[model samples]
Target chain A: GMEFLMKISHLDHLVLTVADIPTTTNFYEKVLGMKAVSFGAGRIALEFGHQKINLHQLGNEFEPKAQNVRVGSADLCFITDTVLSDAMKHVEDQGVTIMEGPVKRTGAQGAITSFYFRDPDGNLIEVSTYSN
Target chain B: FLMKISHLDHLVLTVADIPTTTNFYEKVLGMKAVSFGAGRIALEFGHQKINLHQLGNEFEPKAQNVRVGSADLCFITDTVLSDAMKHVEDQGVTIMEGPVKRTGAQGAITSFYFRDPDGNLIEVSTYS
Candidate 1:
C-alpha cells in the first residue's frame, strides 16, 4: 500500500495565462492589493500575503509551463481576515463589477462568506472571510 | 482602495473524462477523490482540493471558462525526491524531468515533473 507522502506545507502560488499582461497585472494590482513584481525573464507576478500569481501572456509563459496552458482558464478563491461586506464595498469602489456573491461558500478553511468579481482577463477571483 | 486575499482555497481543472483523471489522481498521486456539488467531484490532497470540471458540463458559474488541458500546478510532497521518483515509476507514469531544483513559495525545493492524463503539468517536490 502506498502511504500518503505529499503533505502540502502550504500553497506557494498559481500561474495564470492572460491575453494582456499589463492590463491583467494592473487589475490584480488594483483589485487584490497585490504588488506587481518581476520574475524570470521580465515576466510579472502578482504578490500578496505568502503567495503570488505568476503572470504570463498566452504565448509568453515561462519554460516548463503546463502543457496547453491558455488564457482566462482559472477560477481561484482567496480568503481575507476582514468581514466580507467591507471587502465588497472596497471592490465596487474600485469600479469592478460584482458578478456574484457575498454568498456563502465552503472554503478550504471551513465556512466562509465570499464575493466574486473578474480581473481584466475574466478570471474569476473570489475574496472570502472565514466564519468562526 | 483594493484588498488582498490571504490564502488560496482550491483550484479547478476541466477534464474530458472524470474517471480517467480521478483514477490517476488517486492511484498515482495518493489523493482522495470524493463526490461533491451537483453530481460533481473533487480530488483532495491535504487541506486543498482540485475541483474536476467535465468539458461540457461546466457548472460553477465562476469556473465556466476553464478549459481542459489548461492547468499548471505544483504540489509539495513530504516524500524525499528519490522515493518520489520511485513512486511515479511504480505507477507506470513517466517522469518528464528531475530531482531538479526549483524555487517554491516557502523556499528552495527539489522536484520531479510529469503529466496527468489530460496533459496538465504536475510537479511534485520536497523542501531541501
Candidate 2:
C-alpha cells in the first residue's frame, strides 16, 4: 500500500444516534466505565480512551448527520487491556445479557478475545483485550 | 471506573451491495478482500478492518436491524491523501468532497470525503 493514507484504527470520533440520550449515556457510563461529557448545545458524548462517541437524539440529529441516521444501526468494538473474564460477573449483575463471544477474533493489533452485548438501543457492542 | 476501554476495535458498515463495496475498498484503498464466514465479507487495510454486512442478510449478532448507508467513518493515512485521491478517482469512485484541511485525532489533517457504494460517508485523512 502507498504510504499516503493510514487506516481506520486511528479513528477519532463517531456519532451514535439514540432514541433516548439519557439511556444510552447511562449504559456507556455504567457498563463501559466511561463518562458522558456535554458538547455543543446540550449534546452528550460518551468518552473513552482517546476516542469519543458524540450522542445524538433521534429527532434532534446534528447537521451533517449520517446519511442513514438510524438508531441501533452501529456495530462497534472497544479495546480493553484486562481480562474480560474478571468483569463478566459485573456485567451480568447489571442485567445486561451477553449475546455472543469472548470468542477469538482479530483486532487492529492482531488476536483478541471479545464479548458481545447490546445497549438499550440495540447497537452491537464488543469489548476485547488485545493479545499482544 | 470499572475498566478502561483502550480504544476502538472495528466497525461494521451496512451496505446495499457487498461486491461493489468490496471492489471500492480493494481497488481504491488497496485493502484485502477477506471472506468473514458463511459468505460474509470484510475489508482489511493495514491493521484495521471494516466488516461488511449486506442490507437484508445481516448476521445474528448485529445492530438492531442493519440498514444500508448507516456508517460514517474516518480513516487515517500516513501518506499524501491527494495521491490516494488520484487512486480513488482512477477506481471510478467519485470524490464527494475534500483534500480539505480539518482537525482530526492526531491534530491537523488533510481529508477527502467520498461515498461507498451504499452512500455511506467515508473520510480518508492524513495527519501531519
Candidate 3:
C-alpha cells in the first residue's frame, strides 16, 4: 500500500486576478521590491525570493465578479534586508497610498520593521525587514 | 506622496467543500496537514504550503473562468509513476495529462497534471 509522503514547508505564491497588467506589475515592483519575470499571455509574474507571484489580467469592463469573498488575508509579508524606511520613502515618492507604517512586530526571529497597503486589486501586501 | 504598498506574503485559497479537496490533496498527492485553524486548513508539501479556507459555501458558482496555458504550477515528488496513478484513482480526481517522461532545463522529470474540485491546477512529479 502506498502511504502519504509529502510535507509542505511554506507558501510559494498566490495568483490573483487584476484589471491591468502594467499597473499590477508596477505595484509589485515599485512598492514591494519584487522583480517582474516572464508570464503567460494575459498574466504577469513577480519574483520574490525563490517564489513567483502571478497576476492574471482579466481585461474585462467590470471587476472580476469577486465573490463576497471575506477580505480574508490581513496582509502578505515579504522578508527583506533593505531598510524599511528607505523602501517606504521610495514608495511615498511614487504617490502610492500607504496604509500603515514601518512599525515593529514580535516574531520568533526577533523584532522586525513592517508596513501594509493595498494593490490595484485590493489585495493587502506587507514589506518588512529584520536587521538594520 | 503616500503609496498603497505592501509585500505579498502568501495566498489563502478558499474552498467551498473542504473534505473532498482535502482528501484529494492528501491521498493522491501525499500532502500532510500542517495546521488547523478555526475556519481554515493547511497542507504542506516540499517548501510550498497550501492553505484551504473553508468558506462553507456551495463552491464558487461563477467558476471564475481563469486559465494559464504556458504557465503551470508544479510540485516535485519522490514517488514512482505507477503508484502515483493508483493514488490519483483512489482519490477520485481527474488527471489532465501525464505519467510521461519529459526533459526540462534541469535534466529529466516525470510529471502529471490535475485539477482540484475548485478548478485549481496542480502538477506532481519526480526528477529522474
Candidate 4:
C-alpha cells in the first residue's frame, strides 16, 4: 500500500539570469531594499530575511531567439517589519525604475510594498514586503 | 497620486538555447508539455507551471557569467520518487547531490538534486 503525500514549507528563492551583475544588484538593493550578502566574480546574491534571491551576469546583451515569448513577472515578496512608504522613498532616490507602489491589496491582509522594474537584461522583477 | 496593486502570476525561465534546455527539462524532469506559443514552451506540474523562452544568439553564455544557483526548487510526494529516479537514470543526467533525506527548518524532506544540460540545478523533493 502506498500513501501519497506532498508538502512544501515555502518557496526558498528564485534565481534570475541577468546580463549585468552590478546594475541588477543595485536595482534589488537600492530599489527593493534587499541587501547584498555575497558575491562571486560574476554572480551576486541578495538577502531578504532568511531567503536569498540571486542574480547572475550573462556578460552579453540579452536577445530572445523567439519573439513574443510570454514571459511574466519574476515577483519576490518578503515578510518584513519595515514600513512600506519609507522603503519606496528610499528606492526612488536610488534611480531604480519604479513601475508601481505601496498599495494595499485586499485579500493578502497586508500593506504591500510592491513595485515593478527591469534589470539590465530586461527581466521583470517585483519587490514587495508584507505589513500586516 | 496612488495606485492599486496585485500578486505575482508566475516566474519566467529564459534560456540561451531553447531546444537543448527544453529536451533536458522534458526528458530528465518528467515535466509534461502543456502549451507552446509566443516563442515559448510551457510545462505543468501540480498548480504551478514553468515557461521557457528562447534567447537570442547575443545572450550571454550561462556557463561563464552569472551568479545563479538552484534556478528553481520543486517538491513532490514520496510516491513520485520512483518515477523521478527512473527519469534521471534514463536521461543520464548529472546528479549533483543525493537521493537522500535532509532535515530543514520546517521538517524532514527527501530530495534528489541534479543539473540540467544548461547547468541549472533542479531539485526534486518530498516532505514527510
* Best of the candidates, DockQ: 1
Judging by TM-score against the true structure, name the best candidate: 1
By summed lDDT, the worst window of 10 consecutive residues in model 1 chain A runs over A1-10
Candidate 3 similarity to native, TM-score? 0.62
lDDT digits (tens) for residues B1-128 of candidate 1? 34666767777788989999989988877788887646868888777777787888737575536778787777777667777678787889999899898867656778888989998888888876
Rank order (by TM-score, best first):
1, 2, 3, 4
DockQ of every predicted complex = 0.60, 0.53, 0.15, 0.10
* True lDDT of residue B58, candidate 1: 39
Off by over 4 Å in 4: A1-95, A99-115, A119-123, A126-132, B1-9, B57-83, B103-106
Candidate 4 residue pairs in backbone clash: A43-B67, A56-B66, A56-B67, A57-B66, A63-B56, A64-B56, A65-B55, A65-B56
Model 4: chain A TM-score against the true structure: 0.64
lDDT (Cα, tens digit) per residue for candidate 3, span B52-115? 5565443322123212111234555555665766677666777767887643223466766677
What DockQ number belongs to candidate 2? 0.53
Each model's TM-score, in the order given?
A: 0.91, 0.84, 0.62, 0.49
Query: Comparing to the true complex, what docking class would candidate 4 get?
Result: incorrect
* C-alpha lDDT of residue A44 in model 3: 52
Q: Per-prediction fnat values?
A: 0.59, 0.63, 0.14, 0.06
Q: Each prediction's interface RMSD?
A: 2.3, 2.7, 8.8, 10.3
Clashing pairs for model 1 are none
A14-74 per-residue lDDT for model 1 (tens digits): 6788888888877777767778887556767777777777777887667778777877778
TM-score of chain A of each: 0.89, 0.89, 0.72, 0.64
